[PDB]
């Protein structure tokens, strides 16, 4: 199959505005939310119907208990960071863990933390160590690296457990995750040529402009791949026209193993 990934995020906020959760944790498979938990609901809940239908209540119950504990651990860690930074006010702590199963069958695994949205600690599961970006992180690095068994635990989780979960959820969601909807592509003038694609799935696509058969990445304005709201995606790319010479322009679109060329007359 195509490359797929499983990721879980955590967000902690030290002094949130009223009503706003101090803690949130959300799982994804590829771009699809699969699970959610926060300090207001205090419950782990499905965010995709193909998760609700395939995971029995004991799964949600058990991970609800674990996330209640992870919530508390997150608060304690942020409290410790903000004291050692000597920071007043509201600050954020974030975590991201996950894995990828690549098309060729190889795998990746990653775990990292951020303070106020900036990299803080990054796990290397091959050297079994933590990369610290500053001296507050360096202190945490020393404490975490002192617990060698926990580093080995995380390497096993990233390399074996996480890949196993990914494969299980990919099978649950296969009718969503493994489908292909081809793009509908058109060119218009706005002088710049716009190449516009919509209705496609998966969201990974490459659009570019060729002039006389040569790509010119520096002259191309690449639009973001954006959700259309119905499960499909849209994207665009534009190039400006040279009114001093005649040139053959063409939009090239690559999606899910299919290449398309639209030559502008």
């Amino acid at each position, epitope marked *: 199959m195509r490359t797929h990934s499983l990721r879980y995020f955590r967000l902690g906020v030290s002094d949130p505005i009223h009503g706003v959760p101090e803690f949130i944790s959300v799982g994804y498979v590829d771009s699809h939310p699969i699970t959610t938990y926060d300090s207001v609901t205090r419950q782990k809940e499905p965010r995709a119907p193909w998760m609700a239908e395939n995971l029995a209540p004991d799964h949600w119950e058990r991970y609800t*208990q674990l996330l209640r504990g992870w919530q508390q651990m997150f608060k304690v860690e942020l409290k410790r960071l903000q004291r050692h930074y000597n920071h007043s006010g509201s600050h954020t702590y974030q975590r991201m863990i996950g894995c990828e199963l690549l098309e060729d069958g190889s795998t990746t695994g990653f775990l990292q933390y951020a303070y106020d949205g900036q990299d803080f600690l990054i796990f290397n599961k091959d050297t079994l160590s933590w990369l610290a970006v500053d001296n507050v992180a360096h202190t945490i690095k020393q404490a975490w690296e002192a617990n060698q068994h*926990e580093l080995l635990y995380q390497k096993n989780w990233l390399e074996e*457990e996480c890949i196993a979960w990914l494969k299980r959820f990919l099978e649950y969601g296969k009718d969503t995750l493994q489908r292909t909807e081809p793009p509908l592509v058109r060119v218009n003038r706005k002088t710049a040529l716009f190449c516009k694609a919509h209705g496609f799935y998966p969201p990974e696509i490459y659009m570019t402009w060729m002039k006389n058969g040569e790509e010119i990445v520096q002259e191309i304005d690449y639009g973001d791949i954006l959700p259309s709201g119905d499960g499909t995606y849209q994207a665009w790319a534009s190039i400006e026209l040279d009114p001093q010479s005649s040139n053959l322009y063409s939009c090239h679109v690559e999606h899910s193993g299919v290449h398309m060329v639209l030559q502008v007359p």
Partner: antibody
Amino acid sequence: QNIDQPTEMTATEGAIVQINCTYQTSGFNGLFWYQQHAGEAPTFLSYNVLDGLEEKGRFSSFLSRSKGYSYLLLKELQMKDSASYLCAVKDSNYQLIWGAGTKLIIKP
Amino acid sequence: NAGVTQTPKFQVLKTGQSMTLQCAQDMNHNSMYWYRQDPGMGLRLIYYSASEGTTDKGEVPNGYNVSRLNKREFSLRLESAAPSQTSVYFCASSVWTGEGSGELFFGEGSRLTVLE
């Protein structure tokens, strides 16, 4: 989800004994050994989660994830090693599944 | 310091009688557990408490209830003792749960015999 270890083993003082544990679990987040002297509380001995052998004093603990197998190795046995030894595995949901214990008897 | 302190060490009960087992830990641990140990089988979890402020059933919750009174204390209640509840009860704690490598710290055990 099953853990298996022998009920009882008997070895001689000064010798070496290998206590086996095999497991079939729904996922794997590590294998523990505990010591429990008769009438007393279990105490932690070891944790393994990657493959291989780890030494702590006179005790070593081995793990093979592909064989679903661990042993606890006691060298230079002493009378004080007479105890039960409990194997336990954390599954995919971090539930600990406990073996029924191996009672180790030491002949002076 | 003291580690895990549970009481009582021994208790005789008549069928139908009520009993509370006490457990406290002074190690600033977050997770606490109540197990029973019976001959011929591995430890079985009765109830656990992953963090202060939450508890949930283990594998053998029927006939029991718990209270995570605060971060230190986790009590186990037998509202109406039954002979099948004759067992050795162990309270345990760990720093967190849902992490792989952290071990359990056990109390001394409470031996209960329930008689008709």
